[PDB]
Design an enzyme around this catalytic site. Structure first.
Site, PDB file in Angstrom:
ATOM      1  N   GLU A  75       3.467  14.034   0.049  1.00  0.00           N
ATOM      2  CA  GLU A  75       4.700  14.487  -0.596  1.00  0.00           C
ATOM      3  C   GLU A  75       4.548  14.716  -2.105  1.00  0.00           C
ATOM      4  O   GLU A  75       5.114  15.664  -2.655  1.00  0.00           O
ATOM      5  CB  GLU A  75       5.833  13.492  -0.312  1.00  0.00           C
ATOM      6  CG  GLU A  75       7.191  13.885  -0.887  1.00  0.00           C
ATOM      7  CD  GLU A  75       7.783  15.143  -0.270  1.00  0.00           C
ATOM      8  OE1 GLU A  75       7.407  15.514   0.867  1.00  0.00           O
ATOM      9  OE2 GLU A  75       8.654  15.755  -0.920  1.00  0.00           O
TER      10      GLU A  75
ATOM     11  N   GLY B 262       0.539   6.685   2.883  1.00  0.00           N
ATOM     12  CA  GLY B 262      -0.256   7.910   2.839  1.00  0.00           C
ATOM     13  C   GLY B 262       0.564   9.191   2.851  1.00  0.00           C
ATOM     14  O   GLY B 262       0.178  10.180   2.235  1.00  0.00           O
ATOM     15  N   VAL B 263       1.703   9.161   3.542  1.00  0.00           N
ATOM     16  CA  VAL B 263       2.575  10.327   3.679  1.00  0.00           C
ATOM     17  C   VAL B 263       3.233  10.729   2.354  1.00  0.00           C
ATOM     18  O   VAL B 263       3.442  11.913   2.084  1.00  0.00           O
ATOM     19  CB  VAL B 263       3.661  10.122   4.779  1.00  0.00           C
ATOM     20  CG1 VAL B 263       3.004   9.868   6.142  1.00  0.00           C
ATOM     21  CG2 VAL B 263       4.603   8.969   4.418  1.00  0.00           C
TER      22      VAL B 263
ATOM     23  N   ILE C 204       0.872  -1.167   0.000  1.00  0.00           N
ATOM     24  CA  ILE C 204       0.000   0.000   0.000  1.00  0.00           C
ATOM     25  C   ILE C 204       0.907   1.214   0.000  1.00  0.00           C
ATOM     26  O   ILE C 204       1.862   1.266   0.770  1.00  0.00           O
ATOM     27  CB  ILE C 204      -0.898   0.043   1.261  1.00  0.00           C
ATOM     28  CG1 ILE C 204      -1.886  -1.128   1.258  1.00  0.00           C
ATOM     29  CG2 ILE C 204      -1.661   1.362   1.334  1.00  0.00           C
ATOM     30  CD1 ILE C 204      -2.459  -1.461   2.619  1.00  0.00           C
TER      31      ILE C 204
END
Ligand SMILES: Clc1ccc(OCc2ccccc2)c2ncccc12
Ligand SMILES: Clc1ccc(OCc2ccccc2)c2ncccc12
Ligand SMILES: Clc1ccc(OCc2ccccc2)c2ncccc12
Lengths: 146, 144, 144, 146, 142, 140
Positions: free
Chosen positions: D64, D59-60, D56
């Site tokens: 970015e 999310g970070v 996956i």
């Protein structure tokens, strides 16, 4: 035969990518001596940083390579201690005579000096060659069974 | 002393890590033939994925190495075209005979067949050896 | 049927950085397979091919098609509970257009022959970026 | 509608591998909006670690990516400050709705809200999509120019 | 407390290289707070890309470090749900104060606010006892 | 005189993944140098040394102290404008304690002779000695 390819090396040592530096063992006599090699290719991850302008194998990894080759000997000479996690305890009398370069085959010999297996204390000498000439000399490698 | 080491190979080919697969050029005859080598070590980034249970040098990278070696011949045979980014145009008659493993030395020969001093394009044959035994055969590599 | 990257890894032994199928979008056992590979800058080969210009190496386009070819073989017949196939030969490869970061590489392989438990499979393959042909392969041969 | 390709993006942004997360810019309006994409492939180095059992996109890194995209708009809307090293200063109201997976295309839009030629204070909203569906929503990104 | 060293961190978190960003947990109180650290070295794979001319720990990776630290807290606070794959759901009120550089020690604290899996946590990171990053609310999902 | 790592790369030629000095905290030319390397799990060698147990390989601790040593040399005397030095030999190394993820490695190198430059080197974690090097030998 008397040879060992990287699959069997991986059964003996715990080292993995990017810190397994013994490609092949060509000769081994338990409790006595071991001969093996490491192939030096540009396509290794350390070369980029050492150095951008000029690619020389880090001599400290040349130390590691021999130490791993030396570790195989101990492990195959004596596995009563069913523990393959060998740690460097001390190293002595290292002199580097010649740059090891991409393209070279690194032919390595390590000789077992003393073993007091009850403790986990193994002392070895080491010599590394390229084209039959001496590139790295090591007087004494001390390894610990932990 | 006709040979080319890593530094000068990098002056010829634009390829870099992790896709430069010629360690050394050991013989070269301009417009004729080239002999080189690639050292095969466990300490190369592709072996983890090919395969976890069994380390085999991907055959497609054996095409790549031979073709980079071929690329050097083209560039040193004729550098009027002052541009080192050749591209593979096609490849034909590839057979893989034996696995290439960590510990082997891959010895490679590429032989120049045709160079179009009119059209544009190079055709070369390739052979790769481990301990004198044939591991890869390439009938025709096409360059433009 | 479709097949996700998790199920792909259940069929093929390939791992990072040498697994080159992201998704299989259509499959028909014993006949044809359609899949895709997303081409991004954030892949480890792009640094070395090339620093000045990022072009997906053509040989990895061969790899990806053939990995997609391999899936079809393993799902068409798995009596041979061996997922370790190896490239035996490749014939008639022609690269038409550079494949670049940003591209989607849509890939089709068409099974030609299968000799059961001899373990010989022959397949054709084509790749596309934007409906346009980028790679053509006459015949991929495998040792099952 | 100049499609912007990998090479020209690298001429705008200092980011390199493995931390450049814009593959293409498909639409740009100076001082207004920007649309671009990032292709999501298994053959990326972060996927091994996140996660071994289930890949996956972190999310970070989606943050970015929108951050790099927004950063392109700032530098192409106003480069009087010829310093392309922009740093993240604050981020507010990020929601993740859907997992971003290998094989997906991440389509990204950033909208400029405020920009003061006084320090590098640029505020932007951002949305990411996969198959037209919303995957990442960001109310406000704040970027300081060094 | 008693420390959770690295090997034991890998038994709680499913994250691996190059995306495990918690080096050590120095103190943990289940259902309350967690303190940890991440050593910031040049020998990390992201620094080449961020940036060639100037190495600055990406700000989003400091979010990731704190989010992993938070993750450890949740999983040890309650492992009835024996599923270690927790995913980021929301993050709110992030304000980066100072560049985190090679050589620094990133000391981090996550504070559990609510738990229903739905868990909300605040986060703060320090370098030399100085605040580098603030996070009001991290929201996470099973 | 204190330092950040952008300047370290202007001195040393080492890059990723083989730059092993993060910060120089003290340097007295021709005499002594004090620096540090931060030991994180997010480092490329740890996966291989070892899978089951992450321990900083001892040989890379030699590398760190020696890079720190090579900074002193280059700042003490750069009449020889070659920043590519090479390890010639190393003697009397003893590893007392494992260096692990989480540690700070505080390093000190003391210049002995320069004509060929010799140096001693010690490494600490928490004020406790982890690595001792009697003699490092260099050939620029
Ligand atoms: Cl000044 C300097 C230059 C180059 C280095 O690379 C390691 C090395 C080791 C052995 C032989 C050649 C090079 C260094 N390695 C460790 C310490 C200093 C160094
Ligand atoms: Cl079915 C399959 C299995 C394994 C593969 O790895 C590459 C390779 C290439 C040459 C010889 C052995 C292995 C494959 N490579 C390309 C295409 C298919 C493949
Ligand atoms: Cl001369 C040369 C230059 C560049 C190359 O890159 C690999 C490649 C493969 C397919 C299309 C473009 C480039 C080469 N690949 C194989 C063989 C030669 C090559």
């Amino acid at each position: 035969d008397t040879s060992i390819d990287i699959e069997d090396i991986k059964k003996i040592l715990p080292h993995r990518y990017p810190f397994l530096l013994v490609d092949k063992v060509i000769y081994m006599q338990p409790n006595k001596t071991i001969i093996g090699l490491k192939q030096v290719s540009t396509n290794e991850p350390f070369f980029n940083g050492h150095f951008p302008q000029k690619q020389i194998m880090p001599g400290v990894l040349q130390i590691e390579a021999l130490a791993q080759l030396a570790g195989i000997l101990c492990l195959k000479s004596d596995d009563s201690q069913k523990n393959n996690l060998f740690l460097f305890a001390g190293v002595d009398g290292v002199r580097w005579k010649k740059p090891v370069l991409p393209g070279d085959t690194l032919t390595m010999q390590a000789n077992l000096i003393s073993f007091k297996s009850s403790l986990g204390i193994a002392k070895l000498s080491g010599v590394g060659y390229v084209n039959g000439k001496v590139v790295i000399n090591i007087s004494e490698m001390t390894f610990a069974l932990s």
